[PDB]
Ligand code: SF4
């Protein structure tokens with residue numbers, strides 16, 4: 001029951017997927033989501049995200065509550081990703097920029 005939040009958008013390092021025991025990450029053009037029902041809450045992906053975008057559901061910041069629901073719905077429509085990939089080309093420029101939800105691509 002972990003959740004990918006805002007800082008992932010435009011960064012998408014994919015450092016989180018290799019440690020996932022149940023392969024419950026799904027990828028979008030510029031963001032990743034965790035499938036809530038598949039996730040076993042092992043917490044292993046959280047410290048691996050360079051963007052510090054992953055949070056336990058009950059620890060998702062108040063201002064990013066929308067991502068809980070978002071991960072659930074997008075996990076239904078995006079393809080599963082199980083292998084690390086190169087971060088987006090300008091990940092460092094966007095890492096730390098707030099409100100990147102406005103840049104989310106379906
Ligand atoms: S908490 Fe564990 S099972 Fe859930 S997405 Fe992260 S690595 Fe995968």
Ligand code: F3S
Pocket residue numbers: 004007008009011012013014015016017031032048049050051052053054
């Ligand atoms: S930037 Fe996104 S792709 Fe994974 S390593 Fe962090 S949640």
